[PDB]
Design an enzyme around this catalytic site. Structure first.
Site, PDB file in Angstrom:
ATOM      1  N   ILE A 117      68.701  44.420  27.193  1.00 20.53           N
ATOM      2  CA  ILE A 117      69.067  44.610  28.597  1.00 20.53           C
ATOM      3  C   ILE A 117      67.899  44.160  29.479  1.00 20.53           C
ATOM      4  CG2 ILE A 117      69.812  46.259  30.348  1.00 20.53           C
ATOM      5  CD1 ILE A 117      71.854  46.063  28.203  1.00 20.53           C
ATOM      6  N   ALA A 118      68.197  43.355  30.492  1.00 24.46           N
ATOM      7  CA  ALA A 118      67.170  42.847  31.393  1.00 24.46           C
ATOM      8  C   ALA A 118      66.535  43.970  32.209  1.00 24.46           C
ATOM      9  CB  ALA A 118      67.773  41.800  32.322  1.00 24.46           C
ATOM     10  N   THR A 119      65.350  44.407  31.794  1.00 22.60           N
ATOM     11  CA  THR A 119      64.629  45.466  32.499  1.00 22.60           C
ATOM     12  C   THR A 119      63.151  45.107  32.574  1.00 22.60           C
ATOM     13  OG1 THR A 119      63.962  46.768  30.570  1.00 22.60           O
ATOM     14  CG2 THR A 119      66.175  47.186  31.473  1.00 22.60           C
ATOM     15  N   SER A 120      62.383  45.934  33.284  1.00 22.02           N
ATOM     16  CA  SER A 120      60.947  45.710  33.421  1.00 22.02           C
ATOM     17  C   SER A 120      60.286  45.678  32.037  1.00 22.02           C
ATOM     18  CB  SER A 120      60.315  46.805  34.300  1.00 22.02           C
ATOM     19  OG  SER A 120      60.380  48.090  33.697  1.00 22.02           O
ATOM     20  N   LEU A 121      60.764  46.525  31.128  1.00 21.51           N
ATOM     21  CA  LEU A 121      60.230  46.580  29.768  1.00 21.51           C
ATOM     22  C   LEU A 121      60.356  45.206  29.119  1.00 21.51           C
ATOM     23  CD1 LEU A 121      60.777  49.239  27.056  1.00 21.51           C
ATOM     24  CD2 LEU A 121      61.338  46.860  26.582  1.00 21.51           C
ATOM     25  N   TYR A 179      58.785  52.459  16.644  1.00 22.56           N
ATOM     26  CA  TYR A 179      59.694  52.630  17.769  1.00 22.56           C
ATOM     27  C   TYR A 179      61.095  52.870  17.185  1.00 22.56           C
ATOM     28  CZ  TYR A 179      62.809  51.097  21.594  1.00 22.56           C
ATOM     29  OH  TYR A 179      63.780  50.964  22.560  1.00 22.56           O
TER      30      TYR A 179
HETATM   31  N1  LIG Z   1      65.613  47.030  27.869  1.00 23.25           N
HETATM   32  C1  LIG Z   1      66.138  46.924  26.660  1.00 23.25           C
HETATM   33  O1  LIG Z   1      66.449  45.800  26.256  1.00 23.25           O
HETATM   34  C2  LIG Z   1      66.339  48.213  25.814  1.00 23.25           C
HETATM   35  C3  LIG Z   1      66.931  48.075  24.525  1.00 23.25           C
HETATM   36  C4  LIG Z   1      67.173  49.164  23.650  1.00 23.25           C
HETATM   37  C5  LIG Z   1      66.820  50.467  24.058  1.00 23.25           C
HETATM   38  N2  LIG Z   1      66.228  50.646  25.338  1.00 23.25           N
HETATM   39  C6  LIG Z   1      65.895  52.044  25.678  1.00 23.25           C
HETATM   40  O2  LIG Z   1      66.320  52.304  27.027  1.00 23.25           O
HETATM   41  C7  LIG Z   1      65.432  53.269  27.649  1.00 23.25           C
HETATM   42  C8  LIG Z   1      64.921  52.659  28.955  1.00 23.25           C
HETATM   43  O3  LIG Z   1      64.294  51.403  28.714  1.00 23.25           O
HETATM   44  P1  LIG Z   1      63.980  50.337  29.871  1.00 23.25           P
HETATM   45  O4  LIG Z   1      63.984  48.983  29.277  1.00 23.25           O
HETATM   46  O5  LIG Z   1      64.819  50.600  31.053  1.00 23.25           O
HETATM   47  O6  LIG Z   1      62.481  50.671  30.263  1.00 23.25           O
HETATM   48  P2  LIG Z   1      61.642  50.572  31.604  1.00 23.25           P
HETATM   49  O7  LIG Z   1      62.248  49.506  32.418  1.00 23.25           O
HETATM   50  O8  LIG Z   1      60.229  50.466  31.214  1.00 23.25           O
HETATM   51  O9  LIG Z   1      61.955  52.002  32.212  1.00 23.25           O
HETATM   52  C9  LIG Z   1      61.517  53.202  31.539  1.00 23.25           C
HETATM   53  C10 LIG Z   1      61.643  54.354  32.521  1.00 23.25           C
HETATM   54  O10 LIG Z   1      61.212  55.546  31.833  1.00 23.25           O
HETATM   55  C11 LIG Z   1      60.100  56.113  32.534  1.00 23.25           C
HETATM   56  N3  LIG Z   1      59.078  56.785  31.701  1.00 23.25           N
HETATM   57  C12 LIG Z   1      58.428  56.264  30.623  1.00 23.25           C
HETATM   58  N4  LIG Z   1      57.573  57.144  30.107  1.00 23.25           N
HETATM   59  C13 LIG Z   1      57.715  58.214  30.890  1.00 23.25           C
HETATM   60  C14 LIG Z   1      57.014  59.436  30.758  1.00 23.25           C
HETATM   61  N5  LIG Z   1      56.106  59.636  29.792  1.00 23.25           N
HETATM   62  N6  LIG Z   1      57.327  60.405  31.686  1.00 23.25           N
HETATM   63  C15 LIG Z   1      58.241  60.212  32.667  1.00 23.25           C
HETATM   64  N7  LIG Z   1      58.894  59.036  32.772  1.00 23.25           N
HETATM   65  C16 LIG Z   1      58.648  58.023  31.899  1.00 23.25           C
HETATM   66  C17 LIG Z   1      59.454  54.953  33.254  1.00 23.25           C
HETATM   67  O11 LIG Z   1      58.688  55.403  34.401  1.00 23.25           O
HETATM   68  P3  LIG Z   1      57.081  55.388  34.460  1.00 23.25           P
HETATM   69  O12 LIG Z   1      56.589  54.315  33.582  1.00 23.25           O
HETATM   70  O13 LIG Z   1      56.748  54.993  35.965  1.00 23.25           O
HETATM   71  O14 LIG Z   1      56.607  56.754  34.241  1.00 23.25           O
HETATM   72  C18 LIG Z   1      60.726  54.242  33.725  1.00 23.25           C
HETATM   73  O15 LIG Z   1      61.216  54.936  34.892  1.00 23.25           O
HETATM   74  C19 LIG Z   1      64.341  53.530  26.615  1.00 23.25           C
HETATM   75  O16 LIG Z   1      64.566  54.722  25.835  1.00 23.25           O
HETATM   76  C20 LIG Z   1      64.397  52.295  25.686  1.00 23.25           C
HETATM   77  O17 LIG Z   1      63.959  52.678  24.393  1.00 23.25           O
HETATM   78  C21 LIG Z   1      65.981  49.523  26.227  1.00 23.25           C
HETATM   79  C1  LIG Z   2      62.413  43.447  22.054  1.00 25.47           C
HETATM   80  N1  LIG Z   2      63.024  44.788  22.136  1.00 25.47           N
HETATM   81  C2  LIG Z   2      64.534  44.708  22.157  1.00 25.47           C
HETATM   82  C3  LIG Z   2      64.760  44.612  23.666  1.00 25.47           C
HETATM   83  C4  LIG Z   2      63.591  45.172  24.357  1.00 25.47           C
HETATM   84  C5  LIG Z   2      62.574  45.639  23.313  1.00 25.47           C
HETATM   85  C6  LIG Z   2      62.918  47.086  22.926  1.00 25.47           C
HETATM   86  C7  LIG Z   2      64.360  47.284  22.432  1.00 25.47           C
HETATM   87  O1  LIG Z   2      64.543  48.500  21.692  1.00 25.47           O
HETATM   88  C8  LIG Z   2      64.996  46.096  21.694  1.00 25.47           C
END
Ligand SMILES: NC(=O)c1ccc[n+]([C@@H]2O[C@H](COP(=O)([O-])OP(=O)(O)OC[C@H]3O[C@@H](n4cnc5c(N)ncnc54)[C@H](OP(=O)(O)O)[C@@H]3O)[C@@H](O)[C@H]2O)c1
Ligand SMILES: CN1[C@@H]2CC[C@H]1C[C@H](O)C2
Ligand SMILES: NC(=O)c1ccc[n+]([C@@H]2O[C@H](COP(=O)([O-])OP(=O)(O)OC[C@H]3O[C@@H](n4cnc5c(N)ncnc54)[C@H](OP(=O)(O)O)[C@@H]3O)[C@@H](O)[C@H]2O)c1
Ligand SMILES: CN1[C@@H]2CC[C@H]1C[C@H](O)C2
Lengths: 259, 259
Positions: free
Chosen positions: A191-195, A158
């Site tokens: 960041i607090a997200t579904s992921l 990743y």
């Molecule tokens: N949350 C964190 O702490 C964090 C930290 C560092 C970086 N990030 C980056 O921030 C971005 C968003 O992360 P997030 O935490 O917000 O994730 P999330 O809550 O899982 O949201 C991801 C979004 O991307 C969409 N998606 C994923 N695969 C897709 C595909 N193949 N086609 C079309 N849409 C797609 C998902 O929709 P569907 O699943 O319904 O298609 C959803 O709308 C990512 O690039 C992640 O690497 C997040």
């Molecule tokens: C544990 N990791 C931290 C927060 C969510 C998940 C993916 C991201 O890139 C960094």
């Protein structure tokens, strides 16, 4: 658009049905931009559209599986028509995580993460280029991660997809400068997200996440809007001298060693 | 092996028939290591083997197209048996470049560069893991580039493959620490190799290369042995506390801004 808003600007945000992407759609629209987004679930998208339009936001969305090359081309065609061939902003936000040690990854895991996290962002950028240029004031923002610069458990691959994205960001800033397009990256910490919600489901991953928050100067997770604010700023005409940068919104995590 | 030599150490260096790889083979062998190498040209490999053996080096080589997953598997099997299941050193040196702007790359171009520059290195590392671990003292060295960190003309995608490699390097250093394997990267600046000779055949690229040389403190290209020296050192038992680092051998290029 004025110095501190995006009035009249057109934008495409990938993966805006939840988490960070959703917060970015809200922030850009609330600042005056007309936004277009996508995800793989039409029902989800429609419920997002109902909330956004209830706030007066100009938003449109369509289903797209970014892992598919043909679907991405179809998406750009749709967006170009929707915006009359003029696109001011492109936010490559969609991404996925597969928590496995580097040696436990299968060809399928690798291919999937690489196609969505990096290839899609690269492909979509190239596809959007003529529309970004035609807009005369383009901005490309990649959503990276601290994991793209430093080691995090289960994020070797990743992290690699984000490391590739970061270098692409720096080079595109130079290759497309003459086209009046600025290119930057924003790296979120936690960041607090579904992921993240799905992550803490696993007790070990929950403990791993707790480590990250503790290594934060602010010692707490950020909110989608706290990340979106930086993305919005970079698009403002006010940020006209900023390009080729990877900025972290992480509560200080990147500056830490022994705290 | 003493603290400053590789007596009795076994090593695999990819792409050792020319340039940096050739220099690395000669350096490791001259320091006591038994080396195995590969390339896509049998004739070139045979000429090399003759050169090295006449010098008393313990070297072996077999042709292998690193862009092929099955060939990489075959290579590891042969090396493991050649070294009786114990591999001390793996140097991922093989790489190619395609000088096109990001938006001009074809799918074939992208697939080729990513498969040899990043996938081959990642895959080979995992295949070699059990043997590195079995050696009780393993070392993996990735040959990156200054281009994996900063923008260089026509190296947007090439740089992305290196940026991915750098991040994989940092993570593996942590995932494999318990297996007593150190993992580092060496990023060359401008080194006089066949890759560089072909490059300057074109006047524009020749001028771009001169820009880089003029931007390094020593104002000259490095020689393969100058790069090889750093690779050999990281493998020495003396470098036992060095891991997760990306070290640049560039005549000062990475430290420059306005000179
Ligand atoms: N949350 C964190 O702490 C964090 C930290 C560092 C970086 N990030 C980056 O921030 C971005 C968003 O992360 P997030 O935490 O917000 O994730 P999330 O809550 O899982 O949201 C991801 C979004 O991307 C969409 N998606 C994923 N695969 C897709 C595909 N193949 N086609 C079309 N849409 C797609 C998902 O929709 P569907 O699943 O319904 O298609 C959803 O709308 C990512 O690039 C992640 O690497 C997040
Ligand atoms: C544990 N990791 C931290 C927060 C969510 C998940 C993916 C991201 O890139 C960094
Ligand atoms: N020279 C520089 O200034 C410089 C700067 C920064 C980074 N680097 C990095 O240093 C490494 C070597 O560069 P170099 O300048 O020494 O290049 P080079 O002179 O072209 O040598 C590359 C070697 O790798 C082999 N190789 C390439 N593709 C292969 C494949 N698919 N399968 C098996 N063997 C393959 C080549 O042999 P065949 O072609 O016959 O197969 C050759 O033996 C690369 O990773 C490059 O990115 C070089
Ligand atoms: C022009 N570039 C410089 C020197 C050779 C070629 C590839 C490398 O990574 C950087």
């Amino acid at each position: 658009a004025g110095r501190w808003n995006l009035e009249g600007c057109t934008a495409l945000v990938t993966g805006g049905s939840r988490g960070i992407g959703y917060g970015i759609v809200e922030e850009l629209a609330s600042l005056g931009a007309s936004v277009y987004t996508c995800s793989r679930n039409q029902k989800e998208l429609n419920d997002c559209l109902t909330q956004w339009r209830s706030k007066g936001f100009k938003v449109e969305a369509s289903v797209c599986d970014l892992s598919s090359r043909s679907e991405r081309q179809e998406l750009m065609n749709t967006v170009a028509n929707h915006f009359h061939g003029k696109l001011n902003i492109l936010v490559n936000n969609a991404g996925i995580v597969i928590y496995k040690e580097a040696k436990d990854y299968t060809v399928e895991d690798y291919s999937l993460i690489m196609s969505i996290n990096f290839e899609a962002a690269y492909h979509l950028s190239v596809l959007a280029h003529p529309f970004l240029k035609a807009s005369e004031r383009g901005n490309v923002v990649f959503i990276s991660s601290v994991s793209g610069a430093l080691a995090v458990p289960y994020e070797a691959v990743y992290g690699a997809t984000k490391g590739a994205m970061d270098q692409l960001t720096r080079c595109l800033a130079f290759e497309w400068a003459k086209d009046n397009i600025r290119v930057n990256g924003v790296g979120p910490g936690v960041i607090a997200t579904s992921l993240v919600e799905m992550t803490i489901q696993d007790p070990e991953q929950k403990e791993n996440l707790n480590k990250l928050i503790d290594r934060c100067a602010l010692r707490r997770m950020g909110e989608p809007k706290e990340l979106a604010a930086m993305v919005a700023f970079l698009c403002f005409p006010a940020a006209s001298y900023v390009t080729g940068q990877i900025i972290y919104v992480d509560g200080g995590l990147m500056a830490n060693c022994g705290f």
